[model samples]
Target: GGSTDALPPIEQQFYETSSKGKIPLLQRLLSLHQPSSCVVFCNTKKDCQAVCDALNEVGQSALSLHGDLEQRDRDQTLVRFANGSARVLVATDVAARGLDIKSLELVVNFELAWDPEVHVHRIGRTARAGNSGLAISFCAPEEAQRANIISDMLQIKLNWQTPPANSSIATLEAEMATLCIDGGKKAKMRPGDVLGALTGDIGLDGADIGKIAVHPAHVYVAVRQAVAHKAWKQLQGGKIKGKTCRVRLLK
Candidate 1:
């Protein structure tokens, strides 16, 4: 019983149909099996929120979960979804990793995934416990290259004929700063540990953290904007993986 609200930016990109046709499809499919909770899989955090926003605009309740979310927030989101406060849960691949959601009846891939395994995990959220469910994937012409890989790997039958179009969001021009955190050979540190230390000692929230990649030589963590000085000062005496660590903000 939902009406056609404005399409979320990402869904507008993922859906090729006009508003008239798009609304009808959403209503038809969702109305067919109305009782079960749904998981809407998105490729990026921005898109995940877009999907949730569109759903809410039409009176369909939903929540968004992604890697950029703080640990506490992510946990709370998952708990809330499990508890049924939200009828739809939209998330990026990060939330797909080993999330234990039971009895999921539908999964919508607003953006096709890069990894076949991740695709498997996304759909795996449904059809569990021997119950049958449905999985929907939206693929645009540009995304077809990557989508083809997943389709081929899993031998999945993608019957949708139209190609979804992509949208352009506002871009910013800001200086890029890199933070290099060294978890010494003896440390055996992880990204989570480094993130925790930075947040605890440096007052840097998860939003300040960009890409965190661990390497043998050192653990590399990217800090947002220009927080290297503050991060370095805070991580001066921090230890990760049972040993002292060195934090350097690279230009």
Candidate 2:
């Protein structure tokens, strides 16, 4: 599903293939389309991790979201994806219940959801509110009935499309990296405090910084990849609001 959006507003499409073709088709599709922001929905946490691993192994910036992950890890995962520090996020529906990504470009169903409502919700993740989006699914060889059931339940005809014919695969690297600070709202810290520290004290270019998010006990910021390490190191010796903080570069 490219930006063309044959069907405006949103495009619902699927690719028919064997389970073995899942990664292959996904790789090809991504190499061709390369949507700026994407989410791949997996039915199981195991499959979610596997798909994420495959994407990472191929040099694509991908992160896995599941129930077993620590809050700290999941928090950054969402942050990275939402802030464009990560290109793709592979997550299960249950674990992604709280995900809040804006202007999501694409949604890929590595496998079909268990029900129609979930199917709608999965596609709903994209083109939300008033913008346009694309939703695609990779249907296994034996899951045609499941596809038909979802189609019938939703009373919407499924647009089955063939995967890209080319065999070449390309990887997508995010432009920024995440820097996590141990202090946040709980530390009486504000985003401006961190931004001011980075620009005025740490001597970082404000242009190098992207999103600065402050949570209860942590503050996360997106810094240009080229200068992320330097900022992290400088922050190590610098203080925000005259208070020292433990910081790490989530590279």
Q: Which stretches of candidate 1 lie over 4 Å from their true place?
A: 1-28, 141-152, 161-251
lDDT of candidate 2 over 70-156, digit per residue (tens):
889888887787767877789888767746764787888888788767777666664554244567788765777777777677666
Evaluate all candidate structures by whole-model CA lDDT and list the values in order: 0.56, 0.76
lDDT of 2: 0.76
> How does model 1 score by TM-score?
0.49
What C-alpha lDDT does candidate 1 achieve relative to the native structure? 0.56
Clashes of 2: 0
Query: lDDT, candidate 1, residue 66?
Result: 84
Top candidate (lDDT): 2
Runs in model 2 with CA error above 4 Å? 1-7, 129-131, 149-156, 164-166
Worst 10 residues of 2 by lDDT: 2-11
lDDT of 1 at 85: 41
Best by the TM-score measure: 2
State TM-scores per candidate: 0.49, 0.87
Residues 120-168, candidate 1, lDDT per residue (tens digit)?
Answer: 5556544443233456665445666665565566554344556324422
lDDT of 1 at 76: 45
